[PDB]
Amino acid sequence: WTATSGSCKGRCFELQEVGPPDCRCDNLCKSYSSCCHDFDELCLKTARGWECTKDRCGEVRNEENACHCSEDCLSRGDCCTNYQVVCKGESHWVDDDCEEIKVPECPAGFVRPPLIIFSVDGFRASYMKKGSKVMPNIEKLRSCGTHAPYMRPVYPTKTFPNLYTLATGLYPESHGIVGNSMYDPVFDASFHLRGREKFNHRWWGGQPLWITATKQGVRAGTFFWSVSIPHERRILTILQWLSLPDNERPSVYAFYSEQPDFSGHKYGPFGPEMTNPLREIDKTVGQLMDGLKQLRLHRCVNVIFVGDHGMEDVTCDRTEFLSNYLTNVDDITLVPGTLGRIRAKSINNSKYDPKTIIAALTCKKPDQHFKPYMKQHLPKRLHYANNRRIEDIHLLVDRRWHVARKPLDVYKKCFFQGDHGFDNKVNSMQTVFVGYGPTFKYRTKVPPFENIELYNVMCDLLGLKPAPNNGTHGSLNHLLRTNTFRPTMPDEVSRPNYPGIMYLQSEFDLGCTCDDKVENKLEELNKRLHTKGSTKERHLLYGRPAVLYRTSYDILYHTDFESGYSEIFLMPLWTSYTISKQAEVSSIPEHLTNCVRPDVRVSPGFSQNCLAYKNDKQMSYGFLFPPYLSSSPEAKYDAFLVTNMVPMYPAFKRVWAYFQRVLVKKYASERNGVNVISGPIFDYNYDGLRDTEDEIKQYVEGSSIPVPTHYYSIITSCLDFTQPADKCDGPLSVSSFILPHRPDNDESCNSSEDESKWVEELMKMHTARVRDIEHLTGLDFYRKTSRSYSEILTLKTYLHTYESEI
Ligand SMILES: *[C@@H]1O[C@H](CO)[C@@H](O[C@@H]2O[C@H](CO)[C@@H](O[C@@H]3O[C@H](CO[C@H]4O[C@H](CO)[C@@H](O)[C@H](O[C@H]5O[C@H](CO)[C@@H](O)[C@H](O)[C@@H]5O[C@H]5O[C@H](CO)[C@@H](O)[C@H](O)[C@@H]5O)[C@@H]4O)[C@@H](O)[C@H](O[C@H]4O[C@H](CO)[C@@H](O)[C@H](O)[C@@H]4O[C@H]4O[C@H](CO)[C@@H](O)[C@H](O)[C@@H]4O)[C@@H]3O)[C@H](O)[C@H]2NC(C)=O)[C@H](O)[C@H]1NC(C)=O
Ligand SMILES: CCn1ccc2c(OC(C)C)cc(C(=O)N3C[C@@H]4[C@H]5CN(C(=O)c6ccc7[nH]nnc7c6)C[C@H]5[C@@H]4C3)cc21
Ligand SMILES: [Ca+2]
Ligand SMILES: [Cl-]
Ligand code: NA
Ligand code: NA
Ligand code: NA
Ligand SMILES: [Zn+2]
């Protein structure tokens, strides 16, 4: 109940929400059908429109007018935004040459530069170039300020997940807004675009920017606008708030535009009807900047112009129907569209079986336009599994397509020509970022980055300590002129042991064999040197990784590679090696095919054994440093040590051997040498974080050898590829992956073909940031470079996407 009998007189767009049943006058009251009876009349004035005209100049104030052109309007803070242009012969902001803003130029009593977040829904990255002729205000912000060529959204590329990620710095699996529609099985409640359940606080996790600000004594404008409040009134409201006394005035403000998303759905991303919405958004930016210039705040405020996601061509006819695949389609519930989420229609149905649904949806049609996954098998870069609102069965939909349960859902729920939601690396889903103001740099282009990083920077701009989040604080320091955040590298928690030769061959009873008993002071001294670390500077180029948790491990040196060997998990945590451009690939010699050799530096008790692999009929093994890339026949024996062995399903060995035998040398050729660090990952609870030993669900049969859920590799070279990877003076270049360690290749529909036709495609889908690997391993990489720490933070957040140019 709202007793809408109170009044909005002197309360229009009040910042504190008053509690039911008292009537509200805040910018959201319409959304809750809760506004006082005189809210439209007093707060949503429209009379005479939004612009001064010559005949209005110097007028007698009429409080009925939408905005004012009278002599008093500046002191009142309510002039029309073009007042000074029309009436005082000033220029529009967009017509002034840009001039660097070296320091805040703020009025007396401003404690900090205010921040204004100008968010545009569905603003695809390529609109910044493609629409630049019709968007002169936005083009001045972009060219004069700090911009990226695009900013990567989170998955799914839907409105609420991305808006709340911008606000929190968190992945949707962590903030809890994992779609525009959701079912939470614990609450037994549904979140929908229409209706009241979405207003319940229990959906919204983490700590959004407006709460972080308020808790730390920084006042925030209300971020949310009822859809029916016109944009001109939203801008005038912000400009009025900026005129408040010092003690009442917010320091952070948000504007939101439903365009260009609203038209993009109707017309497609580049429909000819899209020019007008882009022109209207640009006019809104012009009103804000003219209004700021009128208040002498246009070289005081930091402005962020940011989108949530892009927009792709999608029409009714490109829909896949589950009724074409499933015999049992009425027993499932699908959340449909540009991603699919499947669960049982009834929890009382004992016949429901996810394995049979996945199989029925796997590689069934030649050009099938979706791929089913259990959520734990989704690419780890999506970080889309650790939330009970994410259904176990997920369908990744190809760009330009939809999935639906039955055809009647599509024509009986055509219209639309655009949509979004697809994989966040898809080029059409990328969006925009520009920052303009005293705290951002001048005429500066920065490389693409992810939207989870922006919460930390907004906290930086307001002097706030961010709540714990998934950004890497410091990684965006290169956007900023001041207020950088300068972190220290984390402290190493476990120091390594450096074992020498401690065991005799006969102490090992591992069931392993090797034809290596074939036999010199010249050469013998040289091999002892290699085992003591004499080639380590060639193969460990950026320092050893730091281990950030408590464990027991050994560093092991060899001619061609260095590793950090875990006594607890019985395999390397990491193996590091450098392959120059001139390196030659060789075969595994016949006499060594089944060779595994005890490592006399490491106890039998801390080693794997071959008999376990012989007994486990599903499990084989591979090697982290590949025998194919040995530097000499004698060095190749090191590659067959038991301490270089890892458990691998035969299906996965197809992938790994092609990577090792073919792709590593191809990358070294292409990049002028590469340094490779590879290793296992254990994430049985799919939380994106390193498992402890008691979280491991699968072991090589009969043994204590844990089975990895994934295998990673980090591939680093010199950004200036005229310098070899091992002799690089400047910035680095990286690409990485996290491959799922699966007992079949069902994910790859062409896997019956030669690995040259499918493996690299798999690896691109599972591209990763170094930072993703850090979370999954508890390791910290690039500890010893000659580069600035913030530059290394940016490197660790890089994702190689393999998409063509935006
Ligand atoms: C991305 O950044 C984020 C933020 O840094 C990272 O997320 C953090 O990860 C931490 C480790 O997983 C996690 O720490 C846990 O916190 C528990 C207390 O949490 C509550 O309070 C905090 C603080 O206000 C709050 O933020 C939490 O909010 C979560 O839950 C509510 C309700 O579900 C949601 O609305 C909200 O969205 C958020 O959910 C998300 O996280 C939870 C996990 O908390 C997931 O389950 C959800 O799916 C969703 O992803 C909470 O309100 C605390 O209880 C945990 O402690 C257990 O484990 C420790 C080990 O240190 C042990 O010592 C403790 O005793 C305890 O064990 C006991 O509980 C076990 C489980 O019940 C039980 O088995 C044992 O026997 C014991 O009884 C733990 O410390 C932190 O909460 C989240 N924060 C957020 C916001 O998500 C995230 O990891 C980063 N991602 C990557 C990839 O790097
Ligand atoms: C900078 C502004 N800003 C930052 C966070 C934030 C926000 O966070 C909440 C999620 C708590 C909400 C806001 C905020 O005011 N809103 C108002 C609108 C809500 C209703 N929507 C829809 O009808 C909708 C729109 C496009 C779609 N495409 N495909 N399907 C779609 C369904 C989504 C939400 C939009 C954002 C603005 C916000
Ligand atoms: Ca884990
Ligand atoms: Cl109302
Ligand atoms: Na053997
Ligand atoms: Na086996
Ligand atoms: Na296959
Ligand atoms: Zn939309």
Could you write out the DSSP letters of every residue in 726-793? GG--S-EEEEEEEEE--SS-TT-TTTTS-GGGTHHHHHHHTEE-HHHHHHHHTEE---S-SS-HHHHH
The whole-angstrom separation of Cα 400 and Cα 18 is 45
CATH label of the domain that carries residue 569: 3.40.570.10
Q: Is 265 annotated as a binding residue?
A: yes
Distance 519 CA to ligand 5 centre (A): 18
CA nearest to 294, candidates 51, 88, 58:
88
Residue 350: other Cβ atoms inside 10 A: 8
Question: Is residue 301 within 8 Å of 113, Cβ to Cβ?
Answer: yes
d(CA 677, CA 540): 9
* Residue 62 CA neighbour count, 13 Å, CB half: 11
User: Which is it for strands 151-152 and 449-450: parallel, antiparallel or unpaired?
Assistant: parallel
Nearest-angstrom CA–CA distance, 164 and 175 = 8
What are the structure tokens assigned to 444, written together? 């500066």
Minimum CA distance residue for ligand 2 atom 15: 224
Nearest in space to 480 (alpha carbons), one of 450, 437, 447: 437
Atom of ligand 2 nearest to the CA of 224: 15
Could you give the 3-state DSSP secondary structure of residue 445? strand
CA–CA gap between residue 76 and residue 358 (Å, rounded): 64
At 33, the amino acid letter reads: S
170 lines ligand 1 (CB under 6 A): yes
What are 318's two structure tokens? 């490109």
d(CA 23, CA 677): 62
Which of 159, 238, 263, 314 maximizes ligand 2 atoms within 8 Å of its Cβ, making it the mutation to test the pocket?
159
Backbone φ/ψ region at 511: left (φ over 0), alpha (ψ -120 to 50), beta: left
Widest pairwise Cα distance in the chain: 106
Identity of the residue numbered 394: H
Cα torsion at 95, 98, 101, 107 (round to 10°)? -10
Closest CA to 81 of 122, 44, 52: 52
Parallel/antiparallel/unpaired status of strands 402-404 and 302-307: unpaired
If 0-12 CB within 10 Å is exposed, 13-18 middle and 19+ buried, where does residue 195 land? exposed
- Residue 766 near residue 713 (C-beta atoms within 8 A): no
Q: For residue 135, give every residue at least 6 positions away whose Cβ sits within 8 Å of its Cβ, in sequence order, or none.
A: 127, 128, 278, 279, 281, 282, 285
Q: How many CA atoms lie within 13 A of 55 on its CB side?
A: 1
Beta bridge partners of 699: 706
* 115-121/302-307 β-pairing: parallel
| Sign, CA torsion 622/627/629/635 | positive
What the block records as the tokens of 631 is: 């530097």
| 616 labelled ligand-binding | no
Angle at 141 between CA 138 and CA 147, to 5 degrees: 105
Cα separation, 485 vs 474, in Å, equals: 5
Number of H helices, E strands in the chain: 23, 29
Query: Tokens at residue 804, please?
Result: 């063509």
Write out the residue range of the structural domain in which residue 769 sits. Answer: 505-797
Nearest to 526 by CA among 635, 618, 685: 635
Read off the tokens for 302. 């930091």
**Residue 65 beta carbon below 6 angstroms from any ligand 1 atom:** no
Q: What's the rounded Cα separation, in Å, for the pair 477 and 459?
A: 13
Which two tokens mark 540? 């460990």
182 C-beta closer than 6 A to ligand 1: no
Angle at 125 between CA 119 and CA 126, to 5 degrees: 135
Sign for the CA dihedral angle at 647, 653, 658, 663 comes to negative
Determine contact, residues 557/499, Cβ cutoff 8 Å. no
| Strands 562-566 and 553-557, bridge-based pairing | antiparallel
* Residues pairing with 555 in the sheet: 564
206: left (phi > 0), else alpha (psi -120 to 50), else beta? left
Instruction: Give residue for tokens 């390529």.
Output: 126
Question: For residue 186, which amino acid is it?
Answer: V
CA distance 56 to 68: 9
Say how far apart CA 32 and CA 24 lie, in whole Å.
Answer: 9
Q: Residue 567: what residue type?
A: E
Q: Is 222 a pocket residue for ligand 2 (Cβ < 6 Å)?
A: no
Q: Is 683 annotated as a binding residue?
A: yes
The CA distance from 412 to 403, in Å, is 15
Residue 723 has what DSSP assignment?
Answer: S
The DSSP code for 407 is H
Per DSSP, 443 falls in state S
The pocket of ion ligand 8, defined by CB under 5 A, consists of 261
Question: Two tokens at 657?
Answer: 């051997």
Which bound ligand lies closest to the C-alpha atom of 682?
Answer: 3
Decide if 343 contacts 333 (C-beta within 8 A): yes
- Residue 268 φ/ψ, nearest 5 degrees: 85, 165
Query: If residue 305 lies in a helix (H) or strand (E), which one and from where to where?
Result: strand 302-307
Nearest Cα residue to 413 out of 344, 352, 334: 334
Distance CA 176, CA 181 (A): 12
Alpha-carbon gap, residue 180 to 157, rounded angstroms: 10
Q: What are phi and psi of 285, to 5 degrees?
A: -60, -40
Distances (CA, A) of 711 to 655, 677, 764, 767: 11, 11, 14, 12
What phi, psi does 276 have (nearest 5°)? -60, -45
Q: How many CA atoms lie within 13 A of 349 on its CB side?
A: 13
For a mutational test of ligand 2's pocket, the pick from 178, 224, 259, 419, i.e. the residue with the most ligand atoms closer than 8 A to its C-beta, is: 224
Indicate if ligand 1 lies below 6 Å from the C-beta of 472: no
**Could you tell me which residues are beta bridge partners of residue 677?**
576, 714
| Nearest atom within ligand 2 for CA of residue 160 | 10
Contacts of 603 (CB under 8 A, 6+ apart): 502, 503
| DSSP H or E stretch at residue 579 | strand 571-579
Q: Is the dihedral of CA 611, 615, 616, 617 positive or negative?
A: positive
Distance of CA 519 to the CA centre of its chain: 54
Q: What is the CA radius of gyration of the chain?
A: 30
460, 772 Cβ separation under 8 angstroms = no
Between CA 567 and CA 704 the distance in angstroms is 11
What's the token pair of residue 86? 């029309």
Cα(229)–Cα(462) distance, integer angstroms: 28
Query: What is the experimental resolution, given in Å to one decimal place?
Result: 1.6
CA torsion sign for 548, 549, 552, 553 is negative
Q: Is 666 helix (H, G, I), strand (E, B) or coil?
A: helix
Residues carrying an active site annotation = 159
Q: Is the peptide bond before 496 cis (omega within 30 degrees of 0)?
A: no
Question: For 703, which DSSP code?
Answer: S
Which residues fall within 8 angstroms of residue 366, CB to CB, at 6 or more apart?
none
Q: Cα separation of 218 and 82, whole Å?
A: 30
Q: Which residue, among 128, 326, 215, 291, has the nearest Cα to 806 in the 3D structure?
A: 128
Q: Please tell me the number of the ligand nearest to residue 691's CA.
A: 3
Calpha distance 297→277 (Å, rounded): 27
Three-class SS state of 395: strand
| Dihedral of alpha carbons 433, 688, 385, 373, sign | positive
Query: At 427, phi and psi to the nearest 5?
Result: -55, -40
Question: 629 and 579 in contact (C-beta within 8 Å)?
Answer: yes
Cα of 174 from ligand 1 centre, angstroms: 9
Neighbouring-strand partners of residue 68:
79
Residue with tokens 């500066």: 444
CA distance 287 to 404: 42
Q: For residues 691 and 742, is the Cβ–Cβ distance under 8 A? A: no
The closest of 642, 627, 646 to 741, measured between CA atoms, is 646
Angle at 63 between CA 58 and CA 65, to 5 degrees: 75
Question: 710-718 and 674-681: which strand pairing?
Answer: antiparallel
CA dihedral 173, 800, 152, 268 (to 10 degrees): -110
Tokens of 487: 């972190």
- Distance, C-alpha 600 to centroid of its chain: 44
Length of the chain: 806
CA–CA gap between residue 277 and residue 272 (Å, rounded): 10
| DSSP 8-state class, residue 399 | T
Instruction: Pull the structure tokens for residue 11.
Output: 């309360």
Residue nearest to atom 9 of ligand 1 (CA): 174
Starting at the edge strand found earlier in the chain, the sheet holding 732-740 runs 553-557, 562-566, 571-579, 674-681, 710-718, 732-740, 767-768
Q: Which residues pair with 780 in a beta bridge?
A: 546
Determination method here? X-ray
Residue 356 to residue 419: CA distance in whole angstroms: 30
Say whether the peptide bond before residue 260 is cis (omega within 30 degrees of 0): yes
- CB 107 less than 6 A from any atom of ligand 1: no
Specify burial of residue 73 (Cβ count, 10 A radius: 0-12, 13-18, 19+).
buried
3-state secondary structure at position 356: helix
Q: Chain centroid to CA 290: how far?
A: 35
Euclidean distance between CA atoms 644 and 440, whole angstroms:
48
Question: Distances in Å between the alpha carbon of 571 and those of 294, 556, 575, 630, 776?
Answer: 66, 11, 10, 20, 16
Q: Is 180 annotated as a binding residue?
A: yes
Give 433's contacts (C-beta < 8 A, 6+ positions apart).
147, 148, 150, 151, 304, 305, 306, 307, 449, 451, 454
With a CB cutoff of 8 Å and minimum separation 6, the contacts of 607 are 508, 510, 570, 598, 599, 642, 643
Q: Is 430 helix (H, G, I), strand (E, B) or coil?
A: coil
Q: 46 CA to middle of ligand 4, Å?
A: 17
Strand partners, 302: 115
Answer whether 117 contacts ligand 2 (Cβ < 6 A): yes
Q: Is the dihedral of CA 207, 211, 212, 215 positive or negative?
A: negative
Q: Which of the ligands is closest to the CA of residue 684?
A: 3
**DSSP secondary structure letter of residue 552:** -
The alpha carbon dihedral of 69, 72, 74, 79 has a sign of negative
Q: Which residues contact 360 (CB under 8 A, 6 or more apart)?
A: 325, 326, 327
Tokens representing 297 are 């705040």
HSE, CB side, 13 Å, CA atoms: give it for residue 199.
Answer: 9
CA angle 469, 481, 256 (to 5 degrees): 55
Q: Is 59 exposed, middle or buried (0-12, 13-18, 19+ CB in 10 A)?
A: middle
- Taking the CA of 775 as reference, the closest ligand is 1
157 in contact with ligand 2, CB cutoff 6 A = no
Residue 402 has which token pair?
Answer: 């939809």
Residue 118 Cα: closest atom of ligand 2:
1
549 in ligand 2 pocket by Cβ < 6 Å? no
Q: Report the candidate in 703, 704, 665, 707 with the shortest Cα–Cα distance to residue 683.
A: 707
Is 687 annotated in some ligand binding site? yes
